[PDB]
């Protein structure tokens, strides 16, 4: 989510989750796009149909 | 009135004959592989069609 930053100044907040084996779920502190490791994640559903908002706004 | 009689006893078997047939497979399986299968659900028109034939009153 972090904006681009600009020299060497931030060192981590941009780069790619590296990985040799990316077929199994990444560890606690690796990166994730929506949801995490643990059981914190978003409920299923679909872009189509609206529960709450719909479209590109929603999750 | 002088006679000579030969007797035949009749016995009347009134079974209760309900049938019940239907023009349909046995198995109506339901496969839900694509996402509008999920949201909009599975409909089957028609599966199955009861013929009703009965001696008594039937519910």
Do not use: H
Request: glycine share 12%; with cysteine.
């Amino acid at each position: 989510k972090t904006a681009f930053d600009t020299g060497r100044a931030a060192l981590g907040e941009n780069n790619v989750y590296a990985s040799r084996d990316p077929f199994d779920r990444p560890s606690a502190d690796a990166r994730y796009i929506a949801g995490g490791n643990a059981p914190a994640e978003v409920a299923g559903g679909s872009y189509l149909v609206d529960d709450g908002a719909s479209g590109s706004n929603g999750a | 009135n002088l006679i000579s009689e030969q007797n035949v006893t009749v016995t009347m078997d009134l079974q209760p004959v309900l049938q019940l047939g239907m023009q349909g497979s046995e198995t109506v399986s339901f496969v839900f592989s694509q996402i509008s299968e999920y949201i909009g659900g599975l409909t089957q028109y028609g599966a199955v069609d009861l013929s009703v034939s009965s001696t008594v009153d039937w519910c």
